[PDB]
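Job type: complex structure
Entries:
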Amino acid sequence: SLHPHAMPDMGPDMNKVPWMGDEQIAMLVYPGMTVMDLVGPHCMFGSLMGAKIYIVAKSLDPVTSDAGLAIVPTATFGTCPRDLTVLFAPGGTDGTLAAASDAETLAFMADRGARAKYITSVCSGSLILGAAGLLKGYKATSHWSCRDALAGFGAIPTEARVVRDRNRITGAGVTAGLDFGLSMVAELRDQTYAECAQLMSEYDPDPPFNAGSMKTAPAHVRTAMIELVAEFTKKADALAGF
Amino acid sequence: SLHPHAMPDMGPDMNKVPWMGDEQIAMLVYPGMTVMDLVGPHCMFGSLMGAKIYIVAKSLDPVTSDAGLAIVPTATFGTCPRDLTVLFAPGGTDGTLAAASDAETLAFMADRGARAKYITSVCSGSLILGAAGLLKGYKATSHWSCRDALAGFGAIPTEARVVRDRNRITGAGVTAGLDFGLSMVAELRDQTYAECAQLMSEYDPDPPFNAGSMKTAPAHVRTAMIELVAEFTKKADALAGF
């Protein structure tokens, strides 16, 4: 800890910002996850000074994402702390269905979820929260391809990019993780801290196209993608008991 | 390859979209990199069917990001293909300065850059491109904390989220990688393909705050962050020969 030694002078208007924290954040990872689902939030959670982030998996062996990027876990269901500030699950497709159907993974999520201050997920990660019995009567969102399946787990499918219901906070598909994350930073610390993180990550998006939502995407793009994810949509519904 | 067997019917209006490709994409990784710098683009490049992505590093040992997330390389400077469709470098801070000062890393970047169809980077990754001699007379952007340093490498610092000059395409700080990536997808395939990727990743951001740019962030946030990165700004200028 030689460095950091002392924070640079932030200015006279920054003396009350909660710079330091002691959050315990567990982020589940598994084979086939969509890595952006994990990293968007990690980018934001990683900005929290003093917080400890645990990359949790069934084992410490590296897990390969749905696009081939391998991440090394830092904790297992056994070494992950019992009481957490935040429990988080990322999405994906077949890898997510596998995780949501794995007894050990569900047991871990159910246990930690019973004591976590915040239960969160991004994208199809909410299928894992639901299968673990963490969304009983809770509003929650997910990727548009499997959002309605959540009803099978007792959740109330809600179409919003970020949904909060008590201590359950869920983000929609993939990139929604960034908005979910920035909001979490403000929730955990304060808005000023979040604004600093936003400026540091230069999070002022300027998408070159306008097909990021089912309502603005060209009809042919919507139709094509609805068909492409058809297999996942049906498997998600099946997983939820429909 | 049992699966995928055949693409689902995309519709009558999708017969001319270049679904298949054969791009060779090399993405440099190193200790201390800001992982979002890599993953934002990876999310988009990963959407390219048929493309081969190489996670290149000095060695195959896992590299830990500036926030503690470890990634496993899949290629070394020796096993990375000689001719690439895209050469890419992510950013970070001290880890980036180290990479931009490492003889072996620069030699690799300089060699591959001499034949790559596209030379790209996100955030401070442009310091690596510059130090490797790949931005001589080229307009390029970077994280706001070190953008001007690029002039020392013969580049023309340009304040834009995404900058293209001939075959040099650079993205600004951290999250800018997503916009850089989506644009690259359209460049490599076509706009329709990019729109499909945008809808699949639900990339229609809705930031909860408005401090993602130096022009909209609260004055006290700008002032605070300018001071926090002061050490990096000076070291970047020094690296560029000022």
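Summary: Chain A touches chain B through 77 residues (CB under 8 Å). Chain A is about 30% helix and 15% strand.
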